[PDB]
Enzyme design. Structure first.
Site, PDB file in Angstrom:
ATOM      1  N   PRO A 240      21.487 -38.082  -0.246  1.00  0.00           N
ATOM      2  CA  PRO A 240      21.947 -36.876   0.472  1.00  0.00           C
ATOM      3  C   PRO A 240      23.418 -36.891   0.953  1.00  0.00           C
ATOM      4  CG  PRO A 240      20.519 -38.195   1.875  1.00  0.00           C
ATOM      5  CD  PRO A 240      20.432 -38.796   0.499  1.00  0.00           C
ATOM      6  N   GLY A 241      23.951 -35.682   1.156  1.00  0.00           N
ATOM      7  CA  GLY A 241      25.259 -35.422   1.794  1.00  0.00           C
ATOM      8  C   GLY A 241      26.467 -36.286   1.364  1.00  0.00           C
ATOM      9  N   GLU A 242      26.478 -36.710   0.107  1.00  0.00           N
ATOM     10  CA  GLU A 242      27.642 -37.345  -0.514  1.00  0.00           C
ATOM     11  C   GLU A 242      28.160 -36.436  -1.661  1.00  0.00           C
ATOM     12  OE1 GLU A 242      29.357 -39.826   0.196  1.00  0.00           O
ATOM     13  OE2 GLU A 242      28.204 -41.080   1.583  1.00  0.00           O
ATOM     14  N   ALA A 243      28.887 -35.371  -1.329  1.00  0.00           N
ATOM     15  CA  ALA A 243      29.174 -34.287  -2.306  1.00  0.00           C
ATOM     16  C   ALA A 243      29.758 -34.750  -3.646  1.00  0.00           C
ATOM     17  CB  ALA A 243      30.071 -33.224  -1.698  1.00  0.00           C
TER      18      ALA A 243
ATOM     19  N   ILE B 200      27.121 -36.705  -5.680  1.00  0.00           N
ATOM     20  CA  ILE B 200      26.055 -35.840  -6.195  1.00  0.00           C
ATOM     21  C   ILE B 200      26.579 -35.000  -7.355  1.00  0.00           C
ATOM     22  CG2 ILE B 200      24.566 -33.875  -5.647  1.00  0.00           C
ATOM     23  CD1 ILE B 200      23.641 -35.306  -3.265  1.00  0.00           C
TER      24      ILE B 200
END
Ligand code: HRC
Length: 196
Positions: free
Chosen positions: A101-104, A107
């Site tokens: 999650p939340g590692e743009a 991802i």
């Protein structure tokens, strides 16, 4: 023979524990002790099997910027067989195999690799990989909208269709494709790995 094998088995178990603490150190220990070959493909196969590995730690490793990790990410996605699967079927498999999650930026790399693989596996579905990438996130967002009660919404099929206008090389996706994806998510939420 037996003593060497028993020692190796325990050291493998230790390697997995080390990996879960810090992926790079885990892989280093396995490689240095000749328990894992230091090739992108062999490391990818190790992660794909995922025996005793935390899916967050797998995602962590796959999300690293350096050359080898990028190469492992590529080989890991290559182990996924998406031929004759629809986009949702493919996502279910991919999204179950790791978490991040939340590692743009990380991802983005992972989902671009997914999109490339899906399209290569199913060349008739999306002529543009951008279409696949954008629609993949639309499905992920739809899953959250339909199944997170925090989300007011519940967008209907007609809204989902409208939100994706113009992304098929300037045209629209077939409405039947969109309906199939919508219905699949509606009827079965994504199984998402819990925070390991
Ligand atoms: C797919 C998903 C959906 C969620 O609602 C929550 C999580 C943690 C995940 N997995 S996720 O790692 O955060 C993620 C992967 C790929 C794209 C976007 C997010």
């Amino acid at each position: 023979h037996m003593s060497k094998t028993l020692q190796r088995n325990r050291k493998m178990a230790m390697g997995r524990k080390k990996f879960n603490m810090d992926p790079k150190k885990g892989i280093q220990f396995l490689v240095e002790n000749e328990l894992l070959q230091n090739t992108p493909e062999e490391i990818a196969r190790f992660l794909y099997k995922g025996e005793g590995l935390n899916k967050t730690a797998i995602g962590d490793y796959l999300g690293e910027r350096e050359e080898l990790n990028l190469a492992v990410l590529h080989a890991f996605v290559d182990l996924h067989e998406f031929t004759d699967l629809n986009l949702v079927q493919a996502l279910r498999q991919f999204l179950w195999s790791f978490r991040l999650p939340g590692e743009a930026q990380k991802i983005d790399r992972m989902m671009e690799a997914f999109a490339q693989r899906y399209c290569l596996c199913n060349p008739g579905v999306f002529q543009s990989t951008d279409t696949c990438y954008v629609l993949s996130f639309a499905v992920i967002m739809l899953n959250t909208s339909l199944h997170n009660p925090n989300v007011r919404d519940k967008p209907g099929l007609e809204r989902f269709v409208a939100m994706n206008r113009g992304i098929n090389e300037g045209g629209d996706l077939p409405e039947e494709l969109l309906r199939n994806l919508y219905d699949s998510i509606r009827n079965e939420p994504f199984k998402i790995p819990e925070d390991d």
